Design a protein around this nucleic acid. Sequence first.
DNA 1: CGAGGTACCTCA
DNA 2: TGAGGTACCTCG
Lengths: 142, 142
Amino acid sequence: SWCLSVHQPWASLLVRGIKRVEGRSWYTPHRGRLWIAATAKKPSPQEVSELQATYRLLRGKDVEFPNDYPSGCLLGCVDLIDCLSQKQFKEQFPDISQESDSPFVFICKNPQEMVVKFPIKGNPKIWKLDSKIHQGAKKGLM
Amino acid sequence: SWCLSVHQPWASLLVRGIKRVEGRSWYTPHRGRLWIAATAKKPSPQEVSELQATYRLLRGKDVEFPNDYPSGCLLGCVDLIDCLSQKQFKEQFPDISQESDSPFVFICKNPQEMVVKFPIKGNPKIWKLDSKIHQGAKKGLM
DNA sequence: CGAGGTACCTCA
DNA sequence: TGAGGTACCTCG
């Protein structure tokens, strides 16, 4: 029932599993499922292509990117299995630690996409989904 | 019947004679009456007092400023008696040449202020007034 | 110039 | 965050 808002294109990269970590300045004790919502900020087409070029390099030439990066909507979820400090991040994930220099790094597993994405208005940090949109989001994960 | 648009507060300082010259990058052969219209850009209260402080220093503590600096209107006129180059300006006006560092300097005498100021939309450089507003402007100088 | 779309900034 | 006022930018 808990959500984090992320700017696109990184938000959809999170729910596809291409982006494996999110960095923030603040810690959370939250573990488990964490819905991912796209903020209202639309990314430029330059921003999308440049960033996709980077993740092709990091992940593989033929990595499959979403056709679209929608704003202001509930995208899917991850399981937040740990919230590591930069120092903990460098010692536990040496092969990906360059992918976030943030003070706190959210380690994500099991990315899931909803095929139908629902409009939503977010809040800072980890915020609670309303029950109506939570129930549809769960049904959207079938 | 020719006009030049100036930003406030300098526009009204011109028609009051507190500001004696105007600097531009471009030369004009125009001589004689030159109406002065304020541009649409409204000046902040800071740039009004700052500039008033400076011209008190240059002209005397008790110099009489206009009560307001209205935008987008015909303010009055000057006689453009010469359009000097920066080199000519330093030669002929040594006591005021610090008051404009522009490539060309409009030398102004005989400032007149209209009592009632008419809305107007300007153009770059020296542009011609429409006859209707010109007849009224001449009438406002009685 | 004047106009207005776009980018930036701040939020009892 | 999302919202919107303000400042900046460009113009057959």
